[PDB]
Chains A and B, each alone.
Chain A
Amino acid sequence: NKVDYSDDRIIQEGDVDINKAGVYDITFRYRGKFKIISSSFKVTV
């Protein structure tokens, strides 16, 4: 079912420096009942 991005099970890794021009590696982790899944994306300022 559809869930919102602000849930308690979603854990993010690192910080996006909006004050600094550069690409950053940010990975979100959702702790499911059976496994934690990981997906990385790059954020360019």
Chain B
Amino acid sequence: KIKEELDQYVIDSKKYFLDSLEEAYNNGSISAESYYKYQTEAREKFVSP
């Protein structure tokens, strides 16, 4: 039940991260370098713990 809950936690936090990161970039509240920094960051951090 830890693995079942943290799989939904890893997936929903990645989905929430990569819908505010694309929102902030398209609105323009973040730079192009910082958008590429936190896209490689979500690929490496928001993964199975």
Point out residues on A near B: beta carbons under 8 Å: 29, 32-38
Q: Does the CB pair B28–A38 fall under 8 Å?
A: yes
The interface bits of chain B over 21-49 (1 if a CB of A lies within 8 angstroms of the residue's CB, else 0) are: 00001111011110000000000000000
Point out residues on B near A: beta carbons under 8 Å: 25-28, 30-33
Q: Does the CB pair A37–B31 fall under 8 Å?
A: no
**A29, A36, A37, A38, most chain B CB atoms within 10 A:** A36
Q: Does the CB pair A29–B26 fall under 8 Å?
A: yes
A38's contact among B26, B30, B32, B33, by CB below 8 Å, is which?
B26
| Across-interface contacts of B28 in A (CB, < 8 A) | 35-38
How near does chain A come to B38, taking the closest CB pair, in angstroms?
14
